[PDB]
Amino acid sequence: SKFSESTLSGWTKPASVTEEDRIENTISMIKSAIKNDNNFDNLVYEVFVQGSYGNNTNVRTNSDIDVNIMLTSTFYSKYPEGKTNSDYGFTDGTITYNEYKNLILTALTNKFGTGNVTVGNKSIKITSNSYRVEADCIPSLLYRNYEYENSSSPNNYIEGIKYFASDNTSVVNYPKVHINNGIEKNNQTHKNYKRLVRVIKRLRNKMTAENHFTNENITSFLIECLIWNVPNNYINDYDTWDETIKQTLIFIKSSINDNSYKNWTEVSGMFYLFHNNRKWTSDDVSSFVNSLWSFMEYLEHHHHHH
């Protein structure tokens, strides 16, 4: 490639933490807001980090921490066909998503100030210089998936989250299963899976910056999911990032061309990576991989002359 091993390895590094206790303080300050609110006294909820910070795949210190405030005492369920709430002894629920979301807004407002709380389409942005909190908060209800493994045991389900965007479209995600699956792949690749995720994101950013390639449908989440689908041998068998990235591009290109990409899941295993309601298509990923191949000059320029 046009880049040195030293340069590529630098682009695999985790994002610097400018505060040693940023995640710690962020969780603390949000948990403080809820626990001091008497309207959450009878509710069971969890505050946890998801997205790039949760997966240690963020490449920019300046980026937003994704914090899920997950209600668990009320939840949504997916049942095997023909089953209903009453088959598990469950009610329709004591509190609605909208009621929960308004309680969360009151708590965060009292803690942070009406000026420092903005409701976005898929998150509540906290800009609190006072508490040093810069966070996107996702109020969600726990999603019990009983259908995936065919459980009739109320205690046996796949745990996801469900919330409604501002437009009231339904979102179901499996952030905890995502995180667990990525740690597992990182353990099987001597921590090179996440290093590879980070260098591909940085190269996407560089390609855009230097006007080589722009496609808004190539998201950070998509890149993490794509590299998660690269077989461990492509990460384990090579002694350079130069070669690891070369074989990664060849495999992804090969996998779109031979239609095996259609069986690829997101990191959670709970949805297909490519489907008609994703922002991206296989054509977007083909273009991305082709632009990266060209940008990295894996086909060396004639006479090494650009």
Ligand SMILES: O=c1ccn([C@@H]2O[C@H](COP(=O)(O)OP(=O)(O)OP(=O)(O)O)[C@@H](O)[C@H]2OP(=O)(O)O)c(=O)[nH]1
């Ligand atoms: O399970 C998921 C998780 C995410 N998404 C899509 O990716 C977008 C960004 O979500 P994040 O949790 O913030 O991902 P992250 O790794 O932090 O990337 P970054 O913040 O660095 O971009 C989601 O909004 C969603 O895409 P849209 O559906 O909103 O277009 C999943 O789809 N499922």
Ligand SMILES: [Mg+2]
């Ligand atoms: Mg994010």
